[PDB]
Symmetry: C2
Subunit: 366 residues, 2 copies
Amino acid sequence: SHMKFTVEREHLLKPLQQVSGPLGPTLPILGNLLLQVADGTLSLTGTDLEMEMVARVALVQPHEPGATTVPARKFFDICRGLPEGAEIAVQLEGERMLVRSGRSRFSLSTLPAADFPNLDDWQSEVEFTLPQATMKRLIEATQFSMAHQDVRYYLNGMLFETEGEELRTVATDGHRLAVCSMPIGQSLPSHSVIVPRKGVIELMRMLDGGDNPLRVQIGSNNIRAHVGDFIFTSKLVDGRFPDYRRVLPKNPDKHLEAGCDLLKQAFARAAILSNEKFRGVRLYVSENQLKITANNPEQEEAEEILDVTYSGAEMEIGFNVSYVLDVLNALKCENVRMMLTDSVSSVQIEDAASQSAAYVVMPMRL
Amino acid sequence: SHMKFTVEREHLLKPLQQVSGPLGPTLPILGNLLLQVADGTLSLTGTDLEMEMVARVALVQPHEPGATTVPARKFFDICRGLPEGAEIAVQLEGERMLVRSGRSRFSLSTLPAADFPNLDDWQSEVEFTLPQATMKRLIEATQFSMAHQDVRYYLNGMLFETEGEELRTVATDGHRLAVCSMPIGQSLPSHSVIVPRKGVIELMRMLDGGDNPLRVQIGSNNIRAHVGDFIFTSKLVDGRFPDYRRVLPKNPDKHLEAGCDLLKQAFARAAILSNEKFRGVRLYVSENQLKITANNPEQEEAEEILDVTYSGAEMEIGFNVSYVLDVLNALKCENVRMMLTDSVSSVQIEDAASQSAAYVVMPMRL
């Protein structure tokens, strides 16, 4: 085969950037993109073995079928570097891939397409289509709560759950937990899968913020997302993910309400004088009042006092201020509700006007 | 003394950010800002021993004189963290400095003002006032050409030269050189001083892009810049800086002209396939034409051909493409002129419509 194609720079740029996502090499070919020309289509694939991103570009100009792999970064940089409106002529020449446009000529090293990894075939168990904005809301509400390199490898990912008419995401690191559910206007079977850390990153990356809908297919060990001309596939993670229903506090009778921004700014200032490693803050809750205290090894001290909506019993509780700030930053709302039990129990935090997302933060011993 | 002052957050923020510039510690007090209250003025000083930045804030509210030093980053973060319009009440309490606003209270560790370094007094030999935009143009045209940790320590700085009615900057690393001169509408004595790397950075940092003029004072071993309520002082560097007059090519008879952007984009694409360490490109100049070639150890190759304005003798010359790209990026102009001699001689590069800046790049052996 003698692979050859000519494509407008503007039809090649966004696909190249998208398929280079899973990249960042061990096996040399993993640093390359797979290019395949067949029946009016150029396919571009990037992989890291755990996941793959494939883009399809319609070939309107004459072309000859074939396949090769080229260095991803170099090929994208060449194409991006060319002027707006450039026509990009690509051709395999022996073991080199030539890229030509105007009087610019580039000859790239290649690796055989036969060597390019290909995820095994599988059958879909559940399928649904939803707006990209729904998927973005779900991931952004919970992504920060995923563990970082925990031994319990399932915590390094994100749980994706279908139930009734809702899609839900759950993330936890064993100290704090985030859960968000959204209706997607279709009845679904109940299914729960764990998407790996990089998989969640790529899912987010392919959401261009437009009106092209997101079609999801879930298998027993794989997930696939289709947006426009892109198809992302990832392996799923093994493990018994914790059950958010059991993590939510049973009777968090003490309800505090406050402006989200005023609460966030008061914790952000207190954080300045918290211990740099442990990040501990002390909260003292009383009638319509919250007091936040932070101190560090140098005995420096921050104290903040806020007017809040609170009428229950007085109590003191310690938290890692970064976990609290992460929740407040993810809520991006007007008012927040904190639902407390006691000094040694978790707090549930929510947007006071929406039960779509719930956050559970375990306290620290004072 | 019992230092105490109350200032509006908006009058304290920009000075705090400005005086923290020289910071980034060995001696603990170097991580602190010196605060001094005396006769309606709060002075804030930051230093790294080689340079100091001092800001003066008028104290319109009652105050008590005194001095202390506080952690720079913590104090700025507290002040920045407070709400817009906040009134900031500061007071020394024993060995702590208290910062109060609304119901926010911070108690910071201190180090004695007596321990704070103070650059020795000196007398000015030359003084001139110029627009901030003139100083910005002079530094930006040459800063990239300064050496990085060269043994010849004077190359790690920037030469500032007064001559006639002009202020000039020169920077070189022994491989490439930049020189820029601007008229400043006042007759000056001829003086040449070397400002250290960090000094050039701080000079640039204090140019707020406004109409407050820059007053410069040069001594035998120090330089000082005054902009609004800020005063920057730096030690000068020892050494015999190279003489740009002798570095400029004597008879660069072969003149090439081209669009700056087209030339830059063609070198930027060729650079993709250049050796990652050596960055060598080969130029072949012929009648109204330039050809740029780059290759790497993997035998990949880029070739660019451009229509240029050229009528002299044919020649081939090698350059480090990063040195060429640095010049083109600093010129930000419509057309560029390259003045060549031979394959083993330097090239002089200039904006085709302005002789204000000149760049000299030594070639590489092909």
